[PDB]
Design a protein around this ligand. Structure first.
Ligand SMILES: [Zn+2]
Length: 601
């Protein structure tokens, strides 16, 4: 148990100063902030904790205000004394999710520098799939130590306390332990992170430098117009009512729009093969087949999609506007995906329909402030260009080299016809093949996406490998080393460990073999995107132009640029993204602008 004897609670300047002096001569020190909220932009600093050595840590309360709380160094005095150390790039800090901390300090005009180690990221790079990368999971895995939980000091449910209401010493136990455990975790993981120059490279030049740029992107937020969203909601209520009527009218009586309950009894009872359509889904969608002739499945389909969209973005988004900035602040997660791509929540920007009109209207609500424009910079099929390189295929490499549509180029070879004559159906077939290879899909899988018979799909795949031999050789070689070493790598050294690579279980080893082929391309795209963000952010920080990087979704970076600077800025973003990342993969950045994200997109 952690008691009040473990860590000191600093309540006077003289003592704070004695610690600042020791901190100033330490090789590295753990740092942590405690606040009255999870919302970064509006949270208030309540206290700070440091750890100079395992077992030697302190908690400095500055804003606890429960009834009769003892005197504390003021938030302002503590920060002016701590500011020099915190802003000194030479004073190296360790922490668990330093992104949060860097931002809190920014609420006071302090730029945390020396952001050298983040134990969450050390863990993530050591093995992204070892398990959760939060401090409590980490402490238990590497230290066989269970940490004091927030719920243990604050309580649960609606009556949970906010940090400023917790007694000084209890808050101390929690806060000082964080700092202490964090430093211990670093001492155990940092040495390990050196057994290999690949992960070390990614951790050092990709992951750590990205910490402060994500903080800045998140705190910038994005301007969302709530009127547009509201009218879209009202219209969707009318449209959903209308569709409900159109459905009742196509059949007879009233009924819910749920399959395997009300639909199979109507749809199949009036002709159609018995199997219902599961919302599995993108592999055999019963309702959409019928759609080509049967009108009911069509309106039920278009109904559900609209209902999901309304409650997920039309009704939720306006509620996400922060009263303090008047903008929305999405959460980017840097240590969650297995391949290294950034994920996103509240809102999850990647789930906004891309090829659909309603998705387009959602994006029309992401607007640029007065005298500014939204700019979208996209890496054209970066994953496919990465495959051309990894397969050393002169065919693909040349297609990209001369600017041809790889899907039409691919079709012209697989079907053997001039590029000008390739039809829309042939382009659609080549495209399914191409993107199917990335996700390592089976000839049968391809068939299920192309709506053609088995072995006909096999026919297309054999023709492809004959024309593009380098891709089969890459695929075989990759599944090989995957079994030889138990993991695959990205161009920068990032690793995805594949434990079921020999699973014996068919399905699991199947998944592990698809992952083997895929991860290197997706992880590499991820690494390129992060390097571009770091690069563009560095220019932004150095030159201070009239632009803000507000979003990162899929393979695009979105900015707010002053209307009178768009041309020079576009030239610059463009050169940085395709000339300041990797010079080996043939990259192309499509830059576009408009009044909203939909127009620039
Ligand atoms: Zn904490």
């Amino acid at each position: 148990m952690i008691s009040y004897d473990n860590y000191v609670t600093i309540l006077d300047e003289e003592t704070l100063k004695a610690w600042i002096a020791k901190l100033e001569k330490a090789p590295v020190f753990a740092f942590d902030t405690e606040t009255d909220s999870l919302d970064n932009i509006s949270a208030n600093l309540v206290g700070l904790s440091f750890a100079i050595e395992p077992g030697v840590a302190a908690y400095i309360p500055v804003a606890h205000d429960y009834l009769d709380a003892p005197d504390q160094i003021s938030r302002e005095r503590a920060l002016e004394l701590l500011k020099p150390l915190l802003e000194d790039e030479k004073a190296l800090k360790v922490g668990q999710n330093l992104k949060y901390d860097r931002g809190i300090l920014a609420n006071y005009g302090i730029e945390l520098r020396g952001i050298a180690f983040d134990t969450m990221l050390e863990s993530y790079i050591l093995n992204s799939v070892a398990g959760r990368h939060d401090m409590d999971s980490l402490a238990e895995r590497w230290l066989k130590h269970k940490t004091i939980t927030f719920e243990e000091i604050a309580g649960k449910g609606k009556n949970q306390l906010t940090f400023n209401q917790i007694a000084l010493e209890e808050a101390g136990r929690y806060a000082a332990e964080d700092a202490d455990v964090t430093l211990q975790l670093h001492l155990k993981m940092w040495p390990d992170l050196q057994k290999h120059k690949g992960p070390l490279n990614v951790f050092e030049n990709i992951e750590m430098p990205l910490v402060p740029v994500l903080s800045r992107i998140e705190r910038n937020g994005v301007k969302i117009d709530p009127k547009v969203l509201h009218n879209h909601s009202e219209e969707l209520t009318l449209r959903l009512a209308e569709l409900e009527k159109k459905a009742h009218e196509i059949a007879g009586e009233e009924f819910n729009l749920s399959s395997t309950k009300q639909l199979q009894t109507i749809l199949f009872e009036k002709q159609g093969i018995k199997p219902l359509k599961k919302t599995p889904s993108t592999s055999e969608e019963v309702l959409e087949e019928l759609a080509l002739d049967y009108p009911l499945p069509k309106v039920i389909l278009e109904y559900r999609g609209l209902a999901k969209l309304k409650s997920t973005y039309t009704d939720k988004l306006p509620l996400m506007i922060n009263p303090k900035t008047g903008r929305v602040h999405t959460s980017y997660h840097q240590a969650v995906t297995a391949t290294g791509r950034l994920s996103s929540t509240d809102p999850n920007l990647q789930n906004i329909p891309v090829r659909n009109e309603e998705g387009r209207r959602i994006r029309q609500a992401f607007i640029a402030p007065e005298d500014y424009v939204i700019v979208s910079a996209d890496y054209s099929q970066i994953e496919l260009r990465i495959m051309a390189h990894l397969s050393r295929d002169k065919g693909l490499l040349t297609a990209f080299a001369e600017g041809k549509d790889i899907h039409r180029a691919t079709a012209a070879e697989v079907f053997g016809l001039p590029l000008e004559t390739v039809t829309s159906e042939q382009r659609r077939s080549a495209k399914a093949i191409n993107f199917g290879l990335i996700y390592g899909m089976s000839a049968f899988g391809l068939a299920r996406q192309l709506n053609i018979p088995r072995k006909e799909a096999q026919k297309y795949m054999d023709l492809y490998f004959e024309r593009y031999p380098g891709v089969l050789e890459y695929m075989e070689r990759t599944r090989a080393q995957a079994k030889e070493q138990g993991y695959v790598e990205t161009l920068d050294g990032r690793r995805l460990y594949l434990p079921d690579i020999k699973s014996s279980n068919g399905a699991r080893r199947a998944a592990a073999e698809r992952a083997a082929i895929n991860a290197p391309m997706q992880g590499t795209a991820a690494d390129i995107i992060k390097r571009a963000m770091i690069a563009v952010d560095a220019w932004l920080q150095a030159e201070q132009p009239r632009v803000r990087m507000i979003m990162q979704v899929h393979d695009e970076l979105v900015f707010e640029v002053h209307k009178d600077d768009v041309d020079a800025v576009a030239k610059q973003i463009h050169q940085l993204m395709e000339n300041c990342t990797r010079l080996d993969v043939p990259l192309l950045v499509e830059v576009g602008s408009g009044e909203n994200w939909d127009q620039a997109h």
